[PDB]
């Protein structure tokens, strides 16, 4: 019941919005997990790992360069926008909205959202493998050697870029190999980020889970914590629940969410 949800929405002083891959798929943004989610011969799971990067950094950078480049044509959707404008409007009223996103596409930022926790990192940040410095980076192409590389066809030839010509750290003293500042399979989420997220979740009085499920990860880490405080949770996702069924709005979030958050 949308009206019952909106009664909670009217009263909420601190909303936490958790977003998963569904919100990015609706912007035309490939996830690379699922039957369609091939890039050349590989799926995301094969490439987004430190072992792939150690043994073929050029291949992994071709993949991330492709993804960075494809974001130029993909735009925020009505769900991203509703979330951004909601935060702005409620902020003026002294009410807090925070976004906790699994997504690395920066679309929430492009939509206008300010209070955003990117728990998996970002496609458009680098981390230096040598000195550890994290830097925002939106250059197209990120380095000259990658220019025009990353084609997704299976029989596209590998660039095989010497490591010295991949993106490097710009402190002319370090010069270390950069990696995407993204959490890979086999890596831990940042402790400091999780502590901040725990604070926000503990203080919130309404939580929305958008383009993923409360029962799946990462929502499963944190939504239980909020539910056990007695706080209402509202899912917006395309997933069904059975017939013998907190709140669930089935469908594309770019349809459901702007109406819900009016």
């Amino acid at each position: 019941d949308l009206t019952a949800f909106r009664e909670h929405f009217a009263k909420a002083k601190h909303i936490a919005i958790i977003t998963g891959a569904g919100v990015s798929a609706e912007s035309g943004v490939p996830t690379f997990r699922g039957p369609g989610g091939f890039w050349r011969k590989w799926q995301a799971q094969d490439l987004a790992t430190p072992e792939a990067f150690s043994r073929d950094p050029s291949l992994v950078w071709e993949f991330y360069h492709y993804r960075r480049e494809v974001m130029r044509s993909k735009m925020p959707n009505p769900a991203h926008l509703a979330i951004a404008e909601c935060e702005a409007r409620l902020g003026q009223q002294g009410r807090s909205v925070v976004i906790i996103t699994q997504n690395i596409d920066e679309l929430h930022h492009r939509a206008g959202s300010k209070h955003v926790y990117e728990i998996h990192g970002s496609l458009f940040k680098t981390r230096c493998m040598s000195c550890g410095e994290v830097k925002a980076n939106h250059k197209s192409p990120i380095c000259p050697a990658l220019d025009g590389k990353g084609a997704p066809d299976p029989n596209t030839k590998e660039a095989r870029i010497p490591v010295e010509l991949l993106p490097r750290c710009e402190r002319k003293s370090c010069n270390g190999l950069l990696r995407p500042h993204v959490v890979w399979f086999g890596e831990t989420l940042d402790s400091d980020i999780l502590t901040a997220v725990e604070r926000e979740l503990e203080k919130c009085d309404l939580c929305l889970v958008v383009g993923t499920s409360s029962i799946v990860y990462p929502a499963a880490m944190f939504a239980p914590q909020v539910a056990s405080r007695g706080v209402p949770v509202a899912e917006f996702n395309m997933e069904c629940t059975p017939a013998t069924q907190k709140y669930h709005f089935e469908g594309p979030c770019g349809s459901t969410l702007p109406p819900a958050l009016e």
Binding site: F185, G186, E187, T188, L189, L194, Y217, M221
Partner: peptide
């Protein structure tokens, strides 16, 4: 530290 996707 939390393994991405519980290591699944």
């Amino acid at each position: 530290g939390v393994l991405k996707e519980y290591g699944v």
